[PDB]
Amino acid sequence: SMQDPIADMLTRIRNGQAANKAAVTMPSSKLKVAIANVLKEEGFIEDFKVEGDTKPELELTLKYFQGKAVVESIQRVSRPGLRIYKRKDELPKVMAGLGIAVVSTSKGVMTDRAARQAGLGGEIICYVA
């Protein structure tokens, strides 16, 4: 059984990215969309659509800067069971702040850099680099 589907979402993106696919498709959920929205805004991925809304699918398109993958690598952190939480000041800096942590705060799913300006802690989903 597919125990965490956001873990799956990121893993399609890594395997996607590795195999030079233009687009990556998977079942959607509101959280997946909200995550893709941060990735899109931070430039890791060009675009997404949500389509087949009778029984959804999300498809997003990957970026290749020049013959080399835009994402260097992306890993899930708040994996089921473990569920790591960070305070506002603790809030982790991925790769000297060149990465991002995607952080589920009570003011939404957002990047660490903006979460830090907000002064709001929360659940750390995945880090990009």
Task: State which of residues 22, 80, 95, 129 lies at the interface with RNA (CB under 7 A).
Answer: 80
d(CA 85, CA 76): 13
Q: Which of 39, 44, 76, 116 binds RNA (CB under 7 A)?
A: 76
The pattern of x and - marking residues 19 through 38 that bind RNA according to CB under 7 A reads x-x----xxxxxxx-x----
55 binds RNA (CB under 7 A): yes
When asked if residue 47 is in the footprint of RNA (CB under 7 A), the reply is: no
Q: Calculate ∠ Cα 57-61-63, nearest 5°.
A: 160
Residue 77 in tokens: 């952190």
Residue 86: count other Cβ atoms within 10 Å of its Cβ: 18
Closest CA to 100 of 122, 78, 69, 73: 73
- Contact between 49 and RNA by CB under 7 A: the answer reads no
Spatial distance between the Cα atoms of 60 and 109, rounded to a whole number of angstroms: 18
Q: Which of 18, 22, 95, 98 binds RNA (CB under 7 A)?
A: 18
Which residues of the chain form contacts with RNA (CB under 7 A)? 1-5, 7-8, 10-12, 14-16, 18-19, 21, 26-32, 34, 55-56, 73, 75-76, 78-82, 85-89, 104-109, 119-123
